[PDB]
Amino acid sequence: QFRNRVINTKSFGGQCRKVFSGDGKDFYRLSGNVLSYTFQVKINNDFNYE
Amino acid sequence: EAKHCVRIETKKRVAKKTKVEHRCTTNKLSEKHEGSFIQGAEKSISL
Numbered sequence: 001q002f003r004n005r006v007i008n009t010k011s012f013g014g015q016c017r018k019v020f021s022g023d024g025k026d027f028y029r030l031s032g033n034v035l036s037y038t039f040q041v042k043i044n045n046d047f048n049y050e
Numbered sequence: 051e052a053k054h055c056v057r058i059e060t061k062k063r064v065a066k067k068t069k070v071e072h073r074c075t076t077n078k079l080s081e082k083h084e085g086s087f088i089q090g091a092e093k094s095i096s097l
Contacts, residue, residue, distance in 0.1 A: 046094075
């Protein structure tokens with residue numbers, strides 16, 4: 001199970017760290033401290049008939 | 051189809067006696083069978 005909030009993910013640190021999500025086609029503000037956050041997609045399909 | 055059938059006749063005169071008998075039997079068997087089986091599988095994996 002995922003559990004409760006432990007890290008503050010939205011301390012911007014006085015930075016204006018815009019990222020443009022090419023997926024959502026929108027700008028988001030990253031925190032000042034997160035190392036990376038990126039929006040490239042993978043899709044995996046497994047399909048079985050018996 | 052199988053049949054076995056016999057007929058017997060006798061007359062004797064000396065007094066007169068006669069006996070005649072006919073016996074017949076038929077046997078038939080038929081059996082019919084049919085069966086069908088089909089199987090199939092698909093796997094599809096896409097990335």
